[PDB]
Amino acid sequence: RTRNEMTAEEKRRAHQKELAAQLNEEAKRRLTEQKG
């Protein structure tokens, strides 16, 4: 009965999980390459 409106937000969350994984990887890589 409920409106029943869906949410691509789940696709957004998945895309954001991928972005967070890539972000952690790249941050670790750049900091290890820097090493002061």
Partner 1 sequence: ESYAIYVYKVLKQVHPDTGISSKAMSIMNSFVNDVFERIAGEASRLAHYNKRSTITSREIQTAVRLLLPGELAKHAVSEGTKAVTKYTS
Partner 2 sequence: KTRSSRAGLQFPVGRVHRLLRKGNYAERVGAGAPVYLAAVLEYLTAEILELAGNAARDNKKTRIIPRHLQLAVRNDEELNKLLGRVTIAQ
Contact residues for partner 2 (CB under 8 A)? Answer: 1-5, 7, 9-10
Query: At closest approach, how far in Å is the CB of 20 from partner 2?
Result: 17
Q: How far is the C-alpha of 26 from the C-alpha of 5, rounded, in Å?
A: 36
Regarding 11 and contact with partner 1 (CB under 8 A), the answer is no
Residue 7 within binding range of partner 1, rule CB under 8 A: no
Distance of alpha carbon 32 from alpha carbon 26, whole angstroms: 10
**Which of 3, 11, 30, 35: binder of partner 1 (CB under 8 A)?**
3
Return the ∠ at Cα 22 (arms to 17 and 25), rounded to 5°: 125
